[PDB]
């Protein structure tokens, strides 16, 4: 058996909503220490990795490793079915045909029980060994989101260029071109608006705007986004949860 209770049902919906577009069929792998999930999109340029630790649930039990694969289209149809104030509990037996989602209200009344049929999927789970990256930055999700959304309108490619004390996003296309230059800064009034930067080497990568426009949907999870770039390697965009993360590993363009 698996019994995992989220304090707020909304959290699971937001989690799924960051993945939901950009990758449809995904294996969720539950075990003693939380649930992890991985998926690569159909064009094989984007890997999505999810990690929800035990501390993110209010109750968690997993007696035996269990993989449960689901279509996220199906699953998000069922996750417009509890209030943002109900508890959601995932329940599965050993070797399951199906996952149960139990939404329960605080006042002991209104139980909604959903049984979602599971799917068979190919579980290439990757132990991703922490790479070292030439640069790391974190900035508000909303700001990153706006940059991407804005430049996307000029081209299908967005170039991220890091130098010392300077981050530069550039897109260049048929109507014209555009660049957003932001500089690291710490505002003490609200340090959530801070922009932080650690640069070992300058980097200069280009990415497909299609994929950045799906990555920025992690903004449903976190106020901030971590971006790790290197010139050899796929970029990491990471949105932190209360005891977990949602990561997007994106291949650069060449």
């Amino acid at each position: 058996m698996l019994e995992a209770k989220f304090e707020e049902a909304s959290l699971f919906k937001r989690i799924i909503d960051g993945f939901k577009d950009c990758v449809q069929l995904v294996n969720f792998q539950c075990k003693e220490d939380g649930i992890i999930a991985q998926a690569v999109d159909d064009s094989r340029v984007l890997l999505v990795s999810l990690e929800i630790g035990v501390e993110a649930f209010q109750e968690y039990r997993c007696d035996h490793p269990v993989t449960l694969g689901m279509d996220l289209t199906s699953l998000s149809k069922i996750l417009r079915c509890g209030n943002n104030t109900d508890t959601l509990t995932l329940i599965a037996d050993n070797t399951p045909d199906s996952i149960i989602l139990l939404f329960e209200d605080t006042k002991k009344d209104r139980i909604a029980e959903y049984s979602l049929k599971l799917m068979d999927i190919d579980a290439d789970f990757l132990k991703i060994e922490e790479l070292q990256y030439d640069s790391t930055l974190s900035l508000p999700s909303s700001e990153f989101s706006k940059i991407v959304r804005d430049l996307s309108q000029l081209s299908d490619s967005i170039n991220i260029m890091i130098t010392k004390e300077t981050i530069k996003f550039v897109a260049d296309g048929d109507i014209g071109s555009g660049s957003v230059i932001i500089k690291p800064f710490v505002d003490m009034e609200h340090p959530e608006t801070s922009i932080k930067l650690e640069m070992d080497q300058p980097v200069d990568l280009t990415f497909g705007a299609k994929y950045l426009l799906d990555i920025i949907k992690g903004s449903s999870l976190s106020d901030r986004v971590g971006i790790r770039l290197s010139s050899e390697a796929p970029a990491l965009f990471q949105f932190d949860l209360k005891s977990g993360f949602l990561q997007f590993f994106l291949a650069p363009k060449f």
């Binding site: 984007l46 890997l47 796929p234 291949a251």
Partner: peptide, 8 residues
């Protein structure tokens, strides 16, 4: 592809 690049 992307799995390859990560595994490097």
């Amino acid at each position: 592809g992307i799995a390859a690049m990560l595994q490097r």
